[PDB]
């Protein structure tokens, strides 16, 4: 797009990852105002309108809140307390033809200052004196649409810095385009709290035996409790099981008869019981009643 015709384009109802922006190693003036660039992918905002121009690299640092200049006065202005990212990188290899890349004209002159976030287009010429121009170009006509000279012999400050503005405004609208959500791997046969794509709960992630039709995402059973789910990256059916729990039965024969105890663990497969009770937290007297030389089922 041009700076006279950077459209306020609506890209909506999709996702755009931003982690691929950092690692490709060509950014020049990648600047995120308001929100941190590290926390851009996980948390988003609404009003994700997008802008684009190949601005010249001499005054990219003039694009700042509370900073005017030439680009911020006659080309494009940030408002104060701006949330969003201005992302500049090198554009020497492709937007630079022989004899000067005269494909992007630019508005050099304007009668007043720009309001921020305004796309400026004009056909008429600048007025500076009292004598009006009669169509034929004269001494005070001052044609604003000059040309950026983008030659391959230009340096890194003279070659264009390709800016894109992922501006984040705040209006009463639903959010459309956000960054990606990071996911961990999946474990099996352990009592784990799980964060799926919409449902969360506590249980044991087990390998399944049934299968679904291709339009169920999850499933429940008698009396409305979730028992099955499918992962969204590999698409395999998975049944869940409730976690280990229950009671400890400890033999006492009465105070006057004896003192020592034996220990029974009801409704538990007792191979994971020092993970179950806090034997590493309690006394060493409690430590010898999570195991022993004799094991009976």
């Amino acid at each position: 797009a041009s700076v006279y015709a950077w459209n306020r384009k609506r890209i909506s109802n999709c996702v755009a990852d931003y982690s691929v922006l950092y690692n490709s190693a060509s950014f020049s003036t990648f600047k995120c105002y308001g929100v941190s660039p590290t926390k851009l992918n996980d948390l988003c905002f609404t009003n994700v309108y997008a802008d684009s121009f190949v601005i010249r690299g001499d005054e990219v640092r003039q694009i700042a809140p509370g900073q005017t200049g030439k680009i911020a006065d006659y080309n494009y202005k940030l408002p104060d307390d701006f949330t969003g990212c201005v992302i500049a990188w090198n554009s020497n290899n492709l937007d630079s033809k022989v004899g000067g890349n005269y494909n992007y004209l630019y508005r050099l002159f304007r009668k007043s200052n720009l309001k921020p976030f305004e796309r400026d287009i004009s056909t008429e010429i600048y007025q500076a004196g009292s004598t009006p121009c009669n169509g034929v170009e004269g001494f005070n006509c001052y044609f604003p649409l000059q040309s950026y000279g983008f030659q391959p012999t230009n340096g890194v400050g003279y070659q264009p810095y390709r800016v894109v503005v992922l501006s984040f405004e705040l209006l009463h609208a639903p959010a459309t385009v956000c960054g990606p959500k990071k996911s961990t791997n999946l474990v099996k046969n352990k009592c784990v709290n799980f964060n799926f794509n919409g449902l969360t709960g506590t249980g044991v992630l087990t390998e399944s035996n049934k299968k679904f039709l291709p339009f169920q995402q999850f499933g429940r059973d008698i009396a409305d409790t979730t028992d099955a789910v499918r992962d969204p990256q590999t698409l395999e059916i998975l049944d869940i099981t409730p976690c280990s729990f229950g009671g400890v039965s400890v033999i006492t024969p009465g105070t006057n008869t004896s003192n020592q105890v034996a220990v029974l663990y009801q409704d538990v497969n007792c191979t994971e019981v020092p993970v179950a009770i806090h034997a590493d937290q309690l006394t060493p007297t409690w430590r010898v009643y999570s195991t022993g030389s004799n094991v009976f089922q």
Partner: nanobody
């Protein structure tokens, strides 16, 4: 909220090597970009070295290209500037800086930085 302590300076002969260090304390996880500044006598403060903490990507100026090396140690939260094959035109005050709003190349003084105290490096 971000504090930098710079050490490792000193005097060296022409063709020697030095290894500066800049130790950070405070909001470590917000730091996204570390740059090395240099203020020559009779010149403005310029940019020399660059390092992105997220990526490990490095950028170097043309006057230090092929001779200067920047390295990051996240265990000690200390960035390093390995300056090998020194010449007496590099006799200047060297400053380490921290950024938290992103990375910008080349370095400019007018942005928001967390400044160090600076050490003296003399090559003769």
């Amino acid at each position: 909220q971000v504090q930098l302590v710079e050490s490792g300076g000193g005097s060296v002969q022409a063709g020697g090597s030095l290894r500066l260090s800049c130790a950070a304390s405070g909001s470590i996880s917000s730091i996204t970009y570390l740059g090395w500044f240099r203020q020559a006598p009779g010149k403005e403060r310029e940019g020399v070295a660059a390092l992105i903490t997220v990526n490990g990507h490095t950028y170097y100026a043309d006057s230090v290209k092929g001779r200067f090396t920047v390295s990051l140690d996240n265990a000690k939260n200390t960035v390093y500037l390995q300056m090998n094959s020194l010449k007496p035109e590099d006799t200047a005050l060297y400053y380490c800086a921290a950024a938290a709003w992103g990375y910008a190349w080349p370095l400019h003084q007018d942005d928001y930085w967390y400044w160090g105290q600076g050490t003296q490096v003399t090559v003769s």
